[PDB]
Write a protein that binds this DNA or RNA. Structure first.
Lengths: 222, 215
RNA sequence: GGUUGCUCGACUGUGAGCGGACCUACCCACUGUGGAAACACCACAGGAACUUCCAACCUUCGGGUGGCGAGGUAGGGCAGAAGAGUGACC
């Protein structure tokens, strides 16, 4: 089918500031369905936020956002919005858009979800990652990777060889440096023989800072 | 007042092909307005049951809801390894809506010892005055592991950070990446850097190590 | 003058277990289902039960038919009638 939901407007925002998440619908018209925002703080659970009911425009809010958020829909644009004002640290979350299914088909379930936009409420300023290479050992398989260090905010993305090398890759979840920044490292294992002849480049993208790094990972120089 | 959805257990380890039961207990009557969702890491939730018993379109028959008054149970007759996810019960009987706090499910496999590596800090990094030592523990299970950094046979404390991958649903295993970090100065005071792994699959604590400057 | 029939009729009534079902229009409501539909909007079905009733219709006068939101407004139906005529009778 074509039923799709695409959020945007999420990002890094200073405490107290404003943002206006959007949600494009694709394979259906939103005038006939209920539309809901659900959010998820990192590693926490789902949390319902707001919704607007078809045919009436009636709006309902989670109590934790009541009077700071406002949900609304533009029929012409087949789009649903969420103005968030007076944001605080704890609004930090992926904000998902959801279609409430057609009653005859899926009750009051939410049968299609967006990929979620990430909203990151802090005041500390953005910074891109220095990407350093994890050279494999000089000694039938050994492992090589990239160390993506001291960036902010989430997320980065690591691919290898422009996404051609997908097998065997582990890109570990960022952990929070006491420095306040994010570090993580990606690795991949390869059979030893390819070392001399196989170029190994990881591609590190950090959209918040507009930083793309490509780092070639070659063996021990000596 | 708000309807509370109080879902247990918080977490569930189970063998492939076991039966698993998750239960959610609505603090008020929510009729049959309860839906069950599967969410895998990094993905949006997917609908499974919606009228507390109605299997959504395309969800496999091994899932089923069942209501008993204010008690809702999602039931997997026999786990598949893909069924690794966090499951949330939702009530849409009243406004505001409400979700369960979620239940995390783990695959269970035979033991796999970790493949172990140790990485000494790049040259570009040591010019910038920082020095990270990385130790990898690849493709193992169960996630229970102990890593210990010894520098010059001195156990370190508080300067290492680790992170773990989720369960590779095909593999059913874990990877870990412990990272000792030191200023360039502290790194240049020692020769031997070593990573001491203790795992159930290893009959003896594996140490990978390197000396500073060996080419 | 009485007795009453006859016709106009101010007005009031439409009475709830030991006993209230007249009609129509609008409004205001309640419950369910359905409308791509948790509230709002619309459509449609329906006002606990046993009773009681025929203001309504049909009747072989045996009986049958159809009918309930004790809501608001209002135009009428049906019941008395204060009063006005007006006859027969004493």
């Amino acid at each position: 089918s074509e039923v799709q939901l695409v959020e945007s407007g999420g990002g890094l925002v200073q405490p107290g500031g404003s943002l206006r998440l959007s949600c494009a619908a694709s394979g259906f018209y939103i005038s006939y369905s209920s539309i809901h925002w659900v959010r998820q703080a990192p590693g926490k659970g789902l949390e319902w936020v707001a919704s607007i009911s078809p045919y009436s425009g009636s709006t309902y809010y989670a109590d934790s956002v009541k009077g700071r958020f406002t949900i609304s829909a533009d029929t012409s644009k087949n789009t649903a919005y969420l103005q968030m004002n007076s944001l605080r640290a704890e609004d930090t979350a992926v904000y998902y858009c959801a279609r409430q299914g057609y009653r005859r088909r899926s009750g009051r379930g939410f049968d299609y979800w967006g990929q979620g936009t990430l909203v990151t409420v802090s005041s500390a300023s953005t910074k891109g990652p220095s990407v350093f290479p994890l050279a494999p050992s000089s000694k039938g398989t050994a492992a090589l990777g990239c160390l993506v260090k001291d960036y902010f905010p989430e997320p980065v993305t690591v691919s290898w060889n422009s996404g051609a090398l997908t097998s065997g890759v582990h890109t570990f979840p960022a952990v929070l440096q006491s420095s306040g920044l994010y570090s993580l490292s990606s690795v991949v294992t390869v059979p030893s023989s390819s070392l001399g002849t196989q170029t190994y480049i990881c591609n590190v993208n950090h959209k918040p800072s507009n930083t793309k790094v490509d780092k070639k990972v070659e063996p021990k120089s000596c | 007042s708000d309807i509370q959805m109080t879902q247990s257990p918080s977490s569930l380890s189970a063998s492939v092909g076991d039966r698993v039961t998750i239960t959610c207990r609505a603090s008020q009557s929510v009729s049959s307005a309860v839906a069950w969702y599967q969410q895998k890491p990094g993905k949006a939730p997917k609908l499974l049951i919606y009228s507390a018993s109605s299997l959504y379109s395309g969800v496999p028959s091994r899932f089923s809801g069942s209501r008993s008054g204010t008690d809702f149970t999602l039931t997997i007759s026999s786990l598949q390894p893909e069924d690794f996810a966090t499951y949330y019960c939702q009530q849409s009987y009243s406004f505001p809506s409400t979700f369960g706090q979620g239940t995390k499910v783990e695959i269970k496999r035979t033991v796999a010892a970790p493949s172990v590596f140790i990485f000494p800090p790049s040259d570009e990094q040591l010019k910038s005055g920082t020095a990270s030592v990385v130790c990898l523990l690849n493709n193992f299970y169960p996630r229970e592991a102990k890593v210990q950094w010894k520098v010059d046979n001195a156990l370190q404390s508080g300067n290492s950070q680790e992170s773990v991958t989720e369960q590779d649903s095909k593999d059913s295993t874990y990877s870990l990446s412990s990272t000792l970090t030191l200023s360039k100065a502290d790194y240049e005071k020692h020769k031997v850097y070593a990573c001491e792994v203790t795992h159930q699959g290893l009959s003896s604590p594996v140490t990978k190590s390197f000396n500073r400057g060996e080419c």
